[PDB]
């Protein structure tokens, strides 16, 4: 889908039917690559939605690994996440977002404990 790929004039250039566009006039193609285009656009937007479910999943288990870490009484949340990082990436959920390193610390700073 990103950047459509000039999908609006390479369609038209196969809507001029081999050069054959005698008996179709111009209203026609724009409205044929506008479906196209807009179907596109859904396609990828579905199958991004696949990846962040996965993500979801994770965000939670990582959140319950840092409380089971730092909770509200036993460990205080770190002010700064290289503070924490460094103390807490024994663990395997801190691996799990490991490819995912801005949520990871955003998430991190915004667990809110209690």
Do not use: C, M
């Amino acid at each position: 889908a990103d950047s459509d790929e000039i999908t609006k004039q390479n369609i038209e250039k196969v809507l001029e039917n081999d050069r054959k566009f005698d008996k179709v006039d111009k209203e026609d193609i724009s409205l044929i690559v506008d479906g196209l285009i807009k179907q596109r656009n859904e396609k990828i937007q579905q199958k991004l939605q696949n990846e962040r479910r996965i993500l979801e999943q994770k965000k939670h288990y990582f959140w319950l690994l840092l409380q089971r870490t730092y909770t509200k009484t036993g460990k205080p949340k770190p002010s700064t996440w290289d503070l924490a990082s460094k103390e807490l990436g024994e663990s395997l959920e801190y691996k799990a977002l490991g490819d995912e390193d801005n949520i990871r610390r955003q998430i991190f700073e915004d667990f809110k404990p209690e």
